[PDB]
Structures are given as C-alpha cells and as structure tokens.
Amino acid sequence: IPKFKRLPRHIAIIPDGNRRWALARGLEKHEGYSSGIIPGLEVYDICVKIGIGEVTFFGFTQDNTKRPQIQRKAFTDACIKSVQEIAKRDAEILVVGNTNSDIFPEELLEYTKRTKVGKGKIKINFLINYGWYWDLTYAYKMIENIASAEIPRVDLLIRWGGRCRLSGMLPVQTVYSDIYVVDEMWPDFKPEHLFKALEFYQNQ
Amino acid sequence: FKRLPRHIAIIPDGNRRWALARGLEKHEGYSSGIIPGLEVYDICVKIGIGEVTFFGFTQDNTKRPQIQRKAFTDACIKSVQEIAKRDAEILVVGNTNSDIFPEELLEYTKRTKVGKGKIKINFLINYGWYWDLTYAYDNSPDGKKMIENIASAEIPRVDLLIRWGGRCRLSGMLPVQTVYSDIYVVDEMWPDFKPEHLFKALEFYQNQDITLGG
Ligand SMILES: CCCCCCCCCCCCCCCC(=O)O
Ligand SMILES: [Mg+2]
Known part of the structure; x- marks a missing residue:
C-alpha cells in the first residue's frame, strides 16, 4: 500500500464488466456477477485500511x-x-x-x-x-x-469495464466528481486499480 | 463514420493553462477559444451532427x-x-x-x-x-x-461529451442529459484544438459495444 498526500472523502464504485469477463473465459453471460463479490470485499478492506470516510457501490x-x-x-x-x-x-x-x-x-x-x-x-x-x-x-x-x-457529494468515481459514463449514478452527487476508468472487467479487480485511481485523484 | 451521436456536448476547458504555458496572463487564453468552436461547428455540419451543446x-x-x-x-x-x-x-x-x-x-x-x-x-x-x-x-404539480x-x-439527452484540458469531470453540465453520456477527454487545452481530437472522439463513440446497454 503506497502513502497518499490527498484522499477523497467519498468514493463511488461502478463494478462493470462482469458479463464480458464471463464470455472471455467461455462462461455464460450471467456467470460473471458472482465473481464480483470478493472484489467488493477487497475494495472495502483497502478503504477501511487507508481510512476512506464513505464508499458508494453501484449495485x-x-x-x-x-x-x-x-x-x-x-x-x-x-x-x-x-x-x-x-x-x-x-x-x-x-x-x-x-x-x-x-x-x-x-x-x-x-x-x-x-x-x-x-x-x-x-x-x-x-x-x-x-x-x-x-x-x-x-x-x-x-x-x-x-x-x-x-449520500453526500462524490469526490472520486472509479468504473471498471473500460466504459466512461455514469449509467445514471447519482446525477446530483457526481456533478463535480473526478472519473477514473479501469479497462479491466470488475471481476479482474487488482489492488493496483484502486491505488492508481487514488494517485490520479491526488494529482488534481 | 458507421455510428454518429445525435447530440455532442463540448467542455472547452484549458484556456488559462494554455495562456500561462505560452507566457501570457491567465485571462488572455479565452479569445484563442473562439476559432476552435467555429472549427467544431464546421466539422459537425459537414458530417451532419444534429445537435452540439457548448459549455460557455x-x-x-x-x-x-x-x-x-x-x-x-x-x-x-x-x-x-x-x-x-x-x-x-x-x-x-x-x-x-x-x-x-x-x-x-x-x-x-x-x-x-x-x-x-x-x-x-x-x-x-x-x-x-x-x-x-x-x-x-417552481410550480410543477408532480414529478412527471x-x-x-x-x-x-x-436540450435533449447527450450521447457524446468531449472535454479538453485533460480533466475527466462534467463540471455540473446538464446532469439530467449526461446520465448515459459517453465521456471522451482530450489532454490538450481547448485553444490547441485539432480536427483529429473530434475525429478520435467520434471513433471512440463508433467503437462502443451496443450489446452492453446503458
Ligand atoms: C455491490 C458490489 C459488488 C457487486 C457484485 C456484482 C453485481 C453488481 C452488478 C454489476 C452491474 C452494475 C454496473 C452496470 C453499469 C451499467 O449499467 O452500464
Ligand atoms: Mg478549467
């Protein structure tokens, strides 16, 4: 875990890419979502660790x-x-x-x-x-x-699955949000993805 | 182009940083932002874009x-x-x-x-x-x-939002119209506009997978 100068108070997570992830591994479209659960736990653990105040998950x-x-x-x-x-x-x-x-x-x-x-x-x-x-x-x-x-103002929004859009997430809270897109599908979550997003945020 | 967006939003950001980087004062960039708008227009009319919304x-x-x-x-x-x-x-x-x-x-x-x-x-x-x-x-009797x-x-739904100056954010542009908007960021400041910027943004949009829904 690297040391951070700035940290966002509120992070939004769009855990997208589940279906494409399943297809790319020769599974059915619906068989990717269950592989999304642990990555959610990983994001939680890392956030509690560096002491993020609030995280909003797009369910x-x-x-x-x-x-x-x-x-x-x-x-x-x-x-x-x-x-x-x-x-x-x-x-x-x-x-x-x-x-x-x-x-x-x-x-x-x-x-x-x-x-x-x-x-x-x-x-x-x-x-x-x-x-x-x-x-x-x-x-x-x-x-x-x-x-x-x-749910207060969103400081950093991180979306997995390479698409750069809000898909109608919290229009009010996201007006000023810095958006970081991970190209890798949500189930392919790596701690590096979150760290790179927090690095992007502190460079603003 | 195979796909075109019906409505493009433009955030012409980067004017002050562009001025500073050329040894001008912060306020002197904006006037160099006028022609780029004209260029976006010409290109949009040419290929037949229905609607463009500029963030003033x-x-x-x-x-x-x-x-x-x-x-x-x-x-x-x-x-x-x-x-x-x-x-x-x-x-x-x-x-x-x-x-x-x-x-x-x-x-x-x-x-x-x-x-x-x-x-x-x-x-x-x-x-x-x-x-x-x-x-x-004001005086709306319901939510509908x-x-x-x-x-x-x-101003209808925005299909493609293109922002210059390398920041990925909406800056409070049309929250209702931008819910499903694909966002393309140009790193170059707005006064440094090149047609290639708009063409790449239209490639990005064309390149989106339409199987994936909202
Ligand atoms: C709640 C955190 C973990 C959730 C595990 C995966 C199940 C959530 C469903 C993911 C899809 C939501 C994002 C879709 C984005 C869109 O509509 O374009
Ligand atoms: Mg600016």
Missing part, C-alpha cells in the same frame, strides 16, 4: 432490470451477498433504491435506514433498484429531499 | 477574478455572434435573471434559426446544475412534470 438500477431474467437473478443475488458480507464487517451500511417494487430484495429492506449510525466508522452505501429519475422526482427543499439525500 | 460559463465560473469573467464572457458573446452568421438553430440556456448574463445573448434564449439552419447549436451561459434542476420545483420543466428541457 443495480431499474434500467438493469430490463436485462434478461437469468442475468437479473445473478446480479441481484451477487448484490444481496455483497451487502450481507459487508454487514458482517464493521461498517455503517445504507441501501438506497425503489423499495415499492417486487424487484427489491426483502433481505436488504432492513438496510434502507443507516445501521450503526454515529459509531465513528466507515459508511458503505449500495444502489439497489436505483433510478436517477426515481431519485430526482422523489422530492415531489428538493435537493435535500431526493431519495439519495443521505 | 457557469454561475460558479463568475466567482473567478473579474479580469477572467470579462474575457470568457466576451469570448462566448463572440462565439455565439460568429455562429449566428452561419447556418444554425441557436439556443442559449442560463440564468437571465442576473446582471451577469450578457444582454447581447438575451435574443438567443428562444431557439433562433439563422441562414439555412438545420444543425442545432446550444450554449450554456451563466448556467448552473442546481439552478437547472430547481427551475422545475419536473423533468419536462427543468431550465434545460429544450
């Missing part, structure tokens, strides 16, 4: 639910497991997303209010059945009243 | 020193006036309820056809993301309204 969106059922099952199960495995660890967990839906997993409903609030420990947010449109129109003041109001 | 300046850019605000305001006025000469449908979006908004651009705050028109050129002039979103929270009633409502 899945209402747009992602329009993908085939065998994929939706895979990334929903992968997301559920990811939250549960971070629940085990010492973290203030919040899940933001449209609960008023069959699609939202019952397992995660208990995290839609921040657990272990004000214990002076890292905050980990998950976007689960999230939509930018759903988020903004949640208001009915407004900026304070958006669904994602508890 | 924000309500945040007005907090900068007065010698700089003067310069980039004048550069923007001149850019619009020079595009107004050509064949474009021109719109300016920004907070007109302010001293800071240039009187010279008030007439363009409703889309204005000039020459043969066709291509839509937008300018963000005294723009702010917070102003844009809250514009809807708000999105349709944001200040920038007339």
Whole structure:
C-alpha cells in the first residue's frame, strides 16, 4: 500500500464488466456477477485500511432490470451477498433504491435506514433498484429531499469495464466528481486499480 | 463514420493553462477559444451532427477574478455572434435573471434559426446544475412534470461529451442529459484544438459495444 498526500472523502464504485469477463473465459453471460463479490470485499478492506470516510457501490438500477431474467437473478443475488458480507464487517451500511417494487430484495429492506449510525466508522452505501429519475422526482427543499439525500457529494468515481459514463449514478452527487476508468472487467479487480485511481485523484 | 451521436456536448476547458504555458496572463487564453468552436461547428455540419451543446460559463465560473469573467464572457458573446452568421438553430440556456448574463445573448434564449439552419447549436451561459434542476420545483404539480420543466428541457439527452484540458469531470453540465453520456477527454487545452481530437472522439463513440446497454 503506497502513502497518499490527498484522499477523497467519498468514493463511488461502478463494478462493470462482469458479463464480458464471463464470455472471455467461455462462461455464460450471467456467470460473471458472482465473481464480483470478493472484489467488493477487497475494495472495502483497502478503504477501511487507508481510512476512506464513505464508499458508494453501484449495485443495480431499474434500467438493469430490463436485462434478461437469468442475468437479473445473478446480479441481484451477487448484490444481496455483497451487502450481507459487508454487514458482517464493521461498517455503517445504507441501501438506497425503489423499495415499492417486487424487484427489491426483502433481505436488504432492513438496510434502507443507516445501521450503526454515529459509531465513528466507515459508511458503505449500495444502489439497489436505483433510478436517477426515481431519485430526482422523489422530492415531489428538493435537493435535500431526493431519495439519495443521505449520500453526500462524490469526490472520486472509479468504473471498471473500460466504459466512461455514469449509467445514471447519482446525477446530483457526481456533478463535480473526478472519473477514473479501469479497462479491466470488475471481476479482474487488482489492488493496483484502486491505488492508481487514488494517485490520479491526488494529482488534481 | 458507421455510428454518429445525435447530440455532442463540448467542455472547452484549458484556456488559462494554455495562456500561462505560452507566457501570457491567465485571462488572455479565452479569445484563442473562439476559432476552435467555429472549427467544431464546421466539422459537425459537414458530417451532419444534429445537435452540439457548448459549455460557455457557469454561475460558479463568475466567482473567478473579474479580469477572467470579462474575457470568457466576451469570448462566448463572440462565439455565439460568429455562429449566428452561419447556418444554425441557436439556443442559449442560463440564468437571465442576473446582471451577469450578457444582454447581447438575451435574443438567443428562444431557439433562433439563422441562414439555412438545420444543425442545432446550444450554449450554456451563466448556467448552473442546481439552478437547472430547481427551475422545475417552481410550480410543477408532480414529478412527471419536473423533468419536462427543468431550465434545460429544450436540450435533449447527450450521447457524446468531449472535454479538453485533460480533466475527466462534467463540471455540473446538464446532469439530467449526461446520465448515459459517453465521456471522451482530450489532454490538450481547448485553444490547441485539432480536427483529429473530434475525429478520435467520434471513433471512440463508433467503437462502443451496443450489446452492453446503458
Ligand atoms: C455491490 C458490489 C459488488 C457487486 C457484485 C456484482 C453485481 C453488481 C452488478 C454489476 C452491474 C452494475 C454496473 C452496470 C453499469 C451499467 O449499467 O452500464
Ligand atoms: Mg478549467
């Protein structure tokens, strides 16, 4: 672990590339997501270590639910497991997303209010059945009243899978965010990816 | 080009750093930012891009020193006036309820056809993301309204955003329209614009895998 001069208060993670990763290894499109769980744990461990205040994970969106059922099952199960495995660890967990839906997993409903609030420990947010449109129109003041109001400004956003876009992640919080793209697919996560992103951030 | 974006956003950043690096004062770069805009336009009209939105300046850019605000305001006025000469449908979006908004651009705050028109050129002039979103929270009876009633409502979704000056960020440009926008960063400052910059950005967009969804 290298020594850092600047550190971002809030990191956003877009863990994209799961399907392409599976295809490139001769697996089915849906068989990459489960390999996304441990990388989530690695990012958590490294963040708690260097003392990052807040991390927001892109879980899945209402747009992602329009993908085939065998994929939706895979990334929903992968997301559920990811939250549960971070629940085990010492973290203030919040899940933001449209609960008023069959699609939202019952397992995660208990995290839609921040657990272990004000214990002076890292905050980990998950976007689960999230939509930018759903988020903004949640208001009915407004900026304070958006669904994602508890999630503050994003300083550094890191996306895996080589695509440079927000895919509708936190339009309000990301307005000024520095974006770092990793070309490697999420399941091919290396600690070097995160370190190189933190190096990019401190050079601003 | 096989694929073309319907709507390109331009963040013409790097003017001050470009000036400094040529032993000029910070404020003296912006005027060298006018012609590059004209070049982007010509190329966009040539290949038949439907819509281009230029980031002019924000309500945040007005907090900068007065010698700089003067310069980039004048550069923007001149850019619009020079595009107004050509064949474009021109719109300016920004907070007109302010001293800071240039009187010279008030007439363009409703889309204005000039020459043969066709291509839509937008300018963000005294723009702010917070102003844009809250514009809807005026007298909108529901949420289905708000999105349709944001200040920038007339500006549709952005397909490709190209930013000069080597920084990968939106700087609060059209948060609603940029949710799915592919972002291409040119390392060179805006005044150092070469056609190759735009052509590479259009290659990047063409090269995107359409199987992958949003
Ligand atoms: C929550 C951290 C670990 C999650 C493990 C993988 C399952 C999450 C699903 C990944 C897809 C989300 C990113 C898609 C981006 C896009 O829509 O373009
Ligand atoms: Mg700048």
